[PDB]
From a paper:
In order to shed light on this fundamental mechanism, we studied S. aureus FapR (SaFapR) a transcription factor that senses the levels of malonyl-CoA, a key intermediate in fatty acid biosynthesis, and modulates the expression of genes involved in fatty acid and phospholipid biosynthesis. FapR has been shown to globally repress the expression of the genes from the fap regulon encoding the soluble FASII system as well as two key enzymes that interface this pathway with the synthesis of phospholipid molecules. Like most transcriptional regulators in bacteria, FapR is a homodimeric repressor. Each protomer consists of a N-terminal DNA-binding domain (DBD) harboring a classical helix-turn-helix motif connected through a linker α-helix (αL) to a C-terminal effector-binding domain (EBD).
The crystal structure of full-length SaFapR in complex with malonyl-CoA, determined at 1.9 Å resolution, revealed a different, more compact conformation of the repressor. Most notably, the two amphipatic linker helices αL, instead of interacting with each other as in the DNA-bound repressor, now bind to either side of the central dimeric EBD. This results in a protein conformation with the two helix-turn-helix domains far apart from each other, corresponding to an incompetent DNA-binding state. The phosphopantetheine and malonyl groups of malonyl-CoA are well defined in the electron density map. The phosphopantetheine group binds within a tunnel at the interface between the two protomers in the SaFapR homodimer, and adopts the same conformation as observed in many acyl-CoA-binding proteins displaying the hot-dog fold. This binding mode results in the complete occlusion of the ligand malonate from the bulk solvent. The charged carboxylate group of malonate is neutralized through a salt bridge with the guanidinium side-chain of Arg110, and makes additional hydrogen bonding interactions with the main-chain nitrogen from Gly111 and the side-chain of Asn119′ from the second protomer. The engagement of Arg110 in malonyl-CoA-binding triggers a local reorganization of hydrogen-bonding interactions and surface reshaping that further stabilize the loop connecting αL to the first β-strand of the hot-dog fold in the non-productive conformation, thus preventing DNA binding. On the other hand, the adenosine 3′-phosphate moiety of malonyl-CoA is largely exposed to the solvent (it is partially disordered in one of the two protomers) and makes no specific contacts with the protein. This implies that SaFapR specifically recognizes the malonyl-phosphopantetheine moiety of the ligand, in agreement with the observation that either malonyl-CoA or malonyl-acyl carrier protein (malonyl-ACP) can indistinctly function as effector molecules.
Residue numbers in the entry:
A (entry chain A): 7 to 189
B (entry chain B): 52 to 189
Write the structure that this text describes.
Amino acid sequence: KLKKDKRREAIRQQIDSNPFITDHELSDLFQVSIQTIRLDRTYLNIPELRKRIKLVAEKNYDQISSIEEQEFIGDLIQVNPNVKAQSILDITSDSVFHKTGIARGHVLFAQANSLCVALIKQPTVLTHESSIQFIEKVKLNDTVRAEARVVNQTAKHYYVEVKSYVKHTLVFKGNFKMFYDKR
Amino acid sequence: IPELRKRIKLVAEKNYDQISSIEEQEFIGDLIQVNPNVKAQSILDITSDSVFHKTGIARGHVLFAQANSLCVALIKQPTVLTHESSIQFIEKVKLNDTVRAEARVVNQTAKHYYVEVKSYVKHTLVFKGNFKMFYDKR
Ligand SMILES: CC(C)(COP(=O)(O)OP(=O)(O)OC[C@H]1O[C@@H](n2cnc3c(N)ncnc32)[C@H](O)[C@@H]1OP(=O)(O)O)[C@@H](O)C(=O)NCCC(=O)NCCSC(=O)CC(=O)O
């Protein structure tokens, strides 16, 4: 009971620091079964990872004004408008070359491009220019986490840098010059 | 000669027979010209699936997908992967537009083809991109 409570405190802290941590990762860290971790989360009222993602994205779509959920590519997991945003995208068979399992370049671009749009709190946002690098192959069943950050803003454009990752590996980089209008 | 739409699909069909880097099901648009390692063209009908529904403006990843597939199809190598690309959205493409993309090889190294893409709606230049395409024979 006493070991459990200390572990449960430690799990609350893990989730606070890293909201999108998996049960497997938690199982490793605390040397208990995935079953124990689920039960721990249940006592703590912390939903399973996919539910946490759905819940937070729902809240995020409420904060943006430049693009609608139905047209957004991936799940918007973090947004600080005009500053920083992140999305995740699961790569399914619909997103790859079937023979190699390699993700299509337009898929990674769509995720990054959509994220730069959602990040900017303006009614009109249009991509003007983009420079991108496909650093490592993204594969079937990978989850891509894209991070976008505003690096400059003028009267007519936001300049945004995007870096996208599979686990800890940088797989894609893009610089986006985004046109906006307050009308 | 069959109907206009049929003919285009047949020219596309016969064009996918001279390429080896990508297949019909994975190619965005219709491949209307291919001169391997030199030049290719494709056309793409912009339907409601490809636009922002509120404004009718084509999604940038759609125009990019056309241009990107076209560059792949152009290069007559077993392995072809986009390494880098730099693109410009010059004019809004709209619902019901047909975009004609033209890809031209401008340079070639041991490891990459450098390809320039220009996309048009009728006579208007709407999109431009430079694509650095990795290739391998093996
Ligand atoms: C371009 C790169 C291969 C360059 O990496 P390196 O410098 O290590 O490459 P290299 O010259 O040593 O060549 C090794 C690569 O050749 C290819 N290769 C080698 N032998 C092969 C074989 N028997 N069968 C198939 N492919 C083979 C593999 O990709 C291999 O990568 P390895 O050694 O790693 O196995 C890589 O940086 C990369 O994959 N970047 C990501 C590219 C990408 O995913 N582009 C977007 C999707 S394609 C796209 O955008 C087009 C579209 O969607 O239409």
